Amino acid sequence: FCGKGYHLMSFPQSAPHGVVFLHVTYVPAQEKNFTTAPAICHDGKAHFPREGVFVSNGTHWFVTQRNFYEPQIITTDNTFVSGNCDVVIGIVNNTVYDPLQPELDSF
């Protein structure tokens, strides 16, 4: 509706018999390939990303937001769980590190 790309904002400018909009839009660039999977099997449970996708640079799995590659480790506070993982097609095994276990193991 307002420029090609995801709309950030826009400014009006007066023209003789009309109006000229300057549409400021965000255009993603410099894309990179990654291997992906819908869920993660861990301890017999399927973990799906809260917001983002599971991406692997070949040998290590991460969660990223869909529009800017900013990788973060798969953890229990940014992935939710839904049943076991016999129904999903495309599951990959990996560890979902939880942040409470290191603190409790320090005891």
Place this chain on the structure above:
Amino acid sequence: KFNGLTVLPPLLTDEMIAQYTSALLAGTITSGWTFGAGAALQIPFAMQMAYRFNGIGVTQNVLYENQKLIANQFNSAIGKIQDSLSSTA
């Protein structure tokens, strides 16, 4: 072509329009909505459908747990269009 009346041919031939729609369809199937924003970035179609379920408010696990059923519904729904077009005048 009778007396002074002429019908000019459209600039885009029917084949060119078919090619436009084929391009749009391949883009939306393979890359989701990324190609409209800019460079076409490809996602597996299941994961893209999960994106879209998140869009409508349903969580993404609902698609993956029910992917076969959703596929069957979509296929049969497309099949119904052929009957509707071919038979209904």
